[PDB]
Amino acid sequence: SKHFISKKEAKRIWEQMSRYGIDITGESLEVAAQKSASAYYIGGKPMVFQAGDLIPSVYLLNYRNPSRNIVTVDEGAEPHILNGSDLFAPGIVSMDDSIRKGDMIFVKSSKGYFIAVGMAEMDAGEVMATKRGKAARIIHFPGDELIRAFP
């Protein structure tokens, strides 16, 4: 049910990920479907999900770190973010100050590794000045539906 895609098809995905500084240029990809979403694999692991928008998997985030839209959360937030909980401002340690409501964000533990992908619900300015409110909704996390669907 998987198929390696052409060089030109892969290039499109590389370019999409390069938008966030995630560098996979030159990596060959296999694609698979569920018609509710598709996944692009690198070496047997799902790396990019097509579920509305193209979403990097937490595996890709840890294999090739993004260079923008990063949000670091504290120890207390991590376990719930790992379960798909929304992200609240009080648990944010730092973040890219260029983040605006609507941007895709990449959530990382204070220990360095990435734990989820989110969609910002607030601008970085308001989050860091108030430290209150829902900063983002999580759209991908370990063991979620995307990962269960694309072993």
Name the site residues for Zn ion (rule: CB under 5 A). Answer: 80, 83
CB of residue 85 vs Zn ion: minimum separation in angstroms?
5
Q: Which is nearer to Zn ion, 10 or 89 (CB)?
A: 89
CB of residue 27 vs Zn ion: minimum separation in angstroms?
33
3-state secondary structure the chain: CCEECCHHHHHHHHHHHHCCCCCCCCCCCEEEECCCCEEEEECCEEEEEEECEEEECHHHHHHCCCCCCEEEECCCCHHHHCCCCCEEHHHEEEECCCCCCCCEEEEEECCCCEEEEEEECCCHHHHHHHCCCEEEEEEECCCCHHHHHCC
Q: Which is nearer to Zn ion, 64 or 140 (CB)?
A: 140
CB of residue 12 vs Zn ion: minimum separation in angstroms?
36
Q: Which is nearer to Zn ion, 83 or 98 (CB)?
A: 83
